[PDB]
Symmetry: D4
Subunit: 235 residues, 8 copies
């Protein structure tokens, strides 16, 4: 099918949480994004409940029209929450910045096993690294989300093209191991296309850039604009 | 009789500083607000730098088309900066929430004279309390800014009409002492009008609610809506 | 203060329940309306749960930024739900169509006390009849909502003028007894002005006409349009 | 040629009949839809006249700029009305939900001939079943509309993929028999693409999802959005 | 109440009739105007059916949400059509340009009598002339519509102020005879206010200027703009 | 391979000339169209002056930012004007609807040479008939403009695919004789694509439908929509 | 009565002339301004034809829907042009910054008389100086336009209050001598209200600020916004 | 890969500098352009500081989200500024119209090397002339920018085809020498596609036409439109 867009609305909550008022509400942003180009909504439940809260998660789970992508660390608390929330997806992240799967195979194998028993499709957030990618496939996870952070932070064009190739190459290798592959982190309006051009990419999860544009332009257009650039890249 | 709107763009920066990238940029937010109903732009330069930064204040001072209202604590560092920056207005704030002017008549006295000698119109952020208002007049400040936080937080409709009355008496009282009076903090699209209808009010400084509405509808309509409400209330 | 607009979103649910699907969602509609001129949101929980469901009320109670006006019949079931929900307002209606308070003073008296003990401000939905009005005051309700239905179905400009005059006198009589007075049912973009011009009116509750304009122009402009016509009438 | 979009406005009427009032009017909705991406308008005249009424069909027949697709059951009443109305298209449906043509070849054969003699191009609403499809061709209908309902209610990505594949094969089988093939029922902004990508599809008939998006964003953008997603899938 | 706006949509049909196609359709324009500021819709059935047709009139009569104002000459054919159409209003015009009432008293008396028997409220289109105005009241018509043509065509400011005074003065005199008074003809975006400022004016019927703006801007805004200028003039 | 759009603003003038005032002004309509997708502006200067006038042509010639396509009959008056005006293009039209070039090979021969000596690119408006096409090539005209009226008026879907094919063969035929080919007259938002997909087509001249859509949505979106459809068809 | 807005479009030409191209065309800008709040259009025909040119004036004189206000220096060349051009208004300006009328009583006396015989209403651009105003009344000019530049360039809020007062006194003074008074030049979104609130003001002529806003928001909104601010001030 | 759009905002400053005010501010225009399709921003720092100034450059260098392309003449002053400024790109221009690189091989060779040590990518603005291109490759510049002015100013369609071809051949030629090639200057909405379709093109730098469109439609749409046209050309 076509490249999917998962909108991370965490930053809506970081705006809210800077004051303890109820606005802006992530429940509203999710309706907007879902109707402006988002194919899924991503939330990251942090232990410190810095932005997204259990309240958001519980309501979002009842209001989303598409599917929730629960981002969380691999800890007993979160696994239990994930198990009871039954989100359609679960992206496991760290408590170059990606999860260390190669070095924690048993831990990761049990988490994937456990989340899948609860009928959740698991995605492991890792670096564009073949060792981590091979390990991901071996612990049994169906998805991986390639960290696009270093590509985004590239300081020169050389650094960027090098990072792009590492990512594209990583995606091809992962697909060959039968993994389905996503990307996200640091993606912006001016750097998303080269990543969206990568054929193996299944869905891009984008947050900060979108919210940063929304304050100026409104969430609806901010999301539609991102989706448009993404589909353009594939055309 | 013409109520002015001062938009506080602090939270544009909080959203940016949650990531370390350059966006969203407060300088862009100011251009938008100034052209959608804002008569002034307010930025609070906190010691910790959390949201608004020195760079922000430096560029803003050269990009604003209206005038700057520097929110700061009364310290030597800040007073130093203010005199260097020469913002049109300076609003003294602590770091019931309002400044304790009566309990520091000399520090405030010198603070005002100093900023006043720099060509800065000083405003003392205080509570709707006559003792403080008398202090501010005695101390020489041209302006005071009545804290509307307790009115915004009033749980019941009764506790609210209660705080409204206190703010209304405090504004008429301030005006009788020759003080020009502003109000800010906690004002929302839903509680602003009652405050705007208060005759003595010179300018309402508003930030969080506007930014909060902005991520949904975009800063321009968010600012324009607030100004429209304010003028309707006066009419 | 400003004439308020309460938006009834029951018909968003009507459109939803015709299919079993989850869209359109009353929770979304409420966010839009509250940010486009609505000062309150109104839902009618019907015993047959035709449109608004227990889920809607449960989620809405957690997502509304303003306040809820729960429309319900006077039955043990509903009263129990109201007490548990703690809506800000409760509008009691029948299961010309107004409540027969004068003929059930005991029942209504117990209902008002009970809800009032739960912190709920009660409104009695009644016809423009001074007997019913006098009784509503006597039973202890702080509010009443005059039934504007007959005025809306006026088949002749004359029947209309006559119905208007009757609401207006009723409103004035209501206010003299100390009641805050609302009005709603059948109000449209073409007949709202004459009712909004009535000074004693506190809040108009409008549903159908707005949703009917929304399927064409979208909810936001539909609510804003209505608020604007309402404030023009007061001006 | 271009994949066409037929917009079903039944639910505009649903919202209307909940009150006895005349708004919203299906006649207006049709003009908006035809000018925003709709290539045809679809109404279902139900024997109970739940939503669309004889008036609507009568006026619509005179105001549509494109062509009407009259959805009706195969009864003497409806057939008589169809013949008198001379709609461009007629979609026969039941009073998984598709018509049992294979089991009523005589009835359907007479129905098709009769309507065809009236100049009406007939479409048989059927399940993605080759027996029914084979029979539709044999009874003489120039069109069929595959029931996309089961595909829409797919509870698992798997049930969905399986339902899709089944529609696709059915479509290809339909085309080989010389049938023009349409599809509709339950299509949404999130599942329309996979169906629009099916080459043999001539026109998709979509109702509810569009009206559901309309109460939020207004009909025009709701229809345009849908057409756009449809042409992107073909591209 | 407030100054009403009657939108004449004749020119929509003159655009249509220049080609014999069905677009643009007056039925659509009427829905738009009615929802953008129009309080009534005006159509002029000319004997030659130059623009508006009997078809338009018959449909419009079933689709208008507000009220039809049938403009027509005082001839047996039209009276019969008026009698069967039962529009809410009927403006009698000539087959300085206004109807000659003073010189055809019997004719006019019978037409008013006849139309009123059919329950139609009659308006006579006349010059800002006291003789014609007195005659209008005497033949029994409830409304008069003052020809604003000469005010519109004024070639100098003197000519315009003179025409304005003749109109204002005419309106005061008519009101004193108990007539309700409208105006229209030649009203534009730059000359409507001075006419809308006249207190006696009940409704302004405007056509050409609105349609002329619509081609550039869209009917909706063209109507909302006119209504806004009109209410501004009265404020 | 890049299809151009030529907007005919004739009907802007017909709307104006229905009143004798200056609005709507064709000169404004041209500025809008040229900036919303039009690559050229067409005006037909009729002997009777009905819509477009000499003033129009004179100012348009100085205001157009693209180029003029003067539609005219082959007469001495018109040919005289054309040579004086020096429009970029000249489209010869009579006053099946197309020019009879074969039956006037000499008049047309001289007409072309004359206009061609003035620096005018000549186009002969003709029917999708090979005899005429051969005549136009023989006569020296650089362009021909295939009449799409019969295709636009085709009642049945069959009579339509019939006319499409004739136009498609006539365009490929024209191209083989070295003629550049345009098409115009009757094209609407709903029949344009099939015509735009024809490879040989250089520019489609379109007027009435655009103006007709313009009174509803405004000229800018009306022109932009048409261009968008045209390019989608080519893609 | 109505405070009028004259839009000066010189800077559209300024932008054009910076490249020798034809765009942007002042003629287009005038259509936009006249339909967005401008009651008049002003162009300054400088002797050096820096921005506005003779074709601009010539064409504009034929396309303006309202009326032209010709700014020009007093020289025979200009008087001949003005006289031949017959603009509705003429504002004599020097080529503080005001026209030295006192110092050239003879020249202006002849200018005013000469322009008046031509039916041109004359306005003298002067400083808020009694000497110049007496002089302007003595010479016979019907209007004066007070130079608000000093008010616009006022640094401090005091320096500015002095300037406002000076303009208001001068306005009152001018009126007492039978002069009608306009203002403008340097007026902006943030400083226009204080001037519009001056009751003697008949029309404010504004250019630069509007054009500067237009490059960001587009001319239509920039003009509507200015007109809105002005009307707000007088109400 | 992706064809890029560099927006030249010099004319924003041109409009500003025409009045000594601070608006419109180039800094605001850059934020708008970068969020509407611009991949870069170009400013020409003229030795006479006619439009863009040193503060503009200084602030822009701190606010641009993408990257700056500094246009400048080759002089020590400029080289020092460029070097100290560290813009991502530098386009050396003369102060046909192209830079005479052949005639000054020494000067440019030092310029290129000097700018490159500073980490600045250098582009030489030249005519589509092989001599100059060879010269540009010999001196070591990594980019060239072909002057499209002659193509833009091409009167006849022939004169224009010659120019296009010349640019395309020069583009192909330049590429064969290892040069990357940009184009721009004089590019407009109506002539940009033919240039964007040239495969060797890396970035088109456009200014004037966009700003000229912006005064009418606002910058955002003017930029988005240009980017859209460009991508359309390459697809
Ligand atoms: O999901 C995905 C996302 C993306 O984002 P961006 O940045 O790219 O947009 O992500 O993950 C992440 C999150 O978690 C972040 O959060 P914070 O908020 O913490 O930063
Ligand atoms: O009704 C009213 C109207 C008005 O118009 P205006 O112009 O003002 O707009 O009217 O009456 C008349 C009509 O009839 C006219 O028509 P036509 O079309 O014929 O011209
Ligand atoms: O509106 P607030 O609550 O965000 O804060 C206002 C600022 O403190 C400015 O004074
Ligand atoms: O406006 P209505 O007729 O839909 O109904 C209003 C509700 O009954 C009040 O909430
Ligand atoms: O899209 P639906 O589910 O509302 O229904 C489609 C209609 O049945 C077809 O016209
Ligand atoms: O599109 P039409 O039917 O209005 O006419 C097109 C014009 O005749 C231009 O060639
Ligand atoms: O508003 P300004 O400063 O651009 O100039 C206005 C013109 O002088 C017109 O009066
Ligand atoms: O598009 P232009 O003609 O305004 O100029 C473009 C600049 O020279 C930037 O390259």
């Amino acid at each position: 099918a076509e490249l999917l867009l998962g909108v991370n609305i965490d930053h809506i909550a970081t705006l809210r949480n800077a004051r303890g008022t109820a606005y802006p509400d992530p429940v509203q942003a999710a309706f907007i994004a879902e109707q402006a180009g988002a194919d899924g909504i991503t939330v990251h439940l942090r232990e410190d409940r810095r932005h997204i809260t259990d309240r958001d998660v519980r309501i979002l789970r009842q209001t989303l029209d598409t599917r929730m992508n629960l981002e969380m660390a691999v800890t007993e608390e979160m696994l239990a929450i994930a198990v009871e929330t039954k989100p359609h997806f679960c992206c496991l992240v760290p408590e170059e910045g990606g999860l260390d799967v190669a070095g924690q195979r048993d831990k990761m194998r049990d988490a994937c096993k456990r989340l899948a028993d609860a009928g959740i499709q698991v995605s492991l957030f890792i670096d564009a690294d073949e060792e981590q990618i091979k390990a991901a496939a071996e612990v049994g996870a169906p998805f991986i989300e390639i960290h696009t952070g270093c590509y985004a932070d590239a300081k020169t064009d050389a650094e960027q093209a090098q990072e792009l190739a590492r990512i594209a190459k990583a995606a091809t290798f992962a697909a060959s191991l039968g993994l389905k592959v996503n990307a996200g982190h640091g993606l912006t309006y001016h750097n998303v296309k080269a990543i969206a051009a990568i054929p193996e990419m299944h869905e891009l999860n984008i947050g900060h850039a979108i919210i940063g544009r929304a304050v100026m332009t409104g969430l609806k257009d901010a999301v539609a604009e991102m989706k448009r650039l993404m589909l353009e890249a594939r055309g």
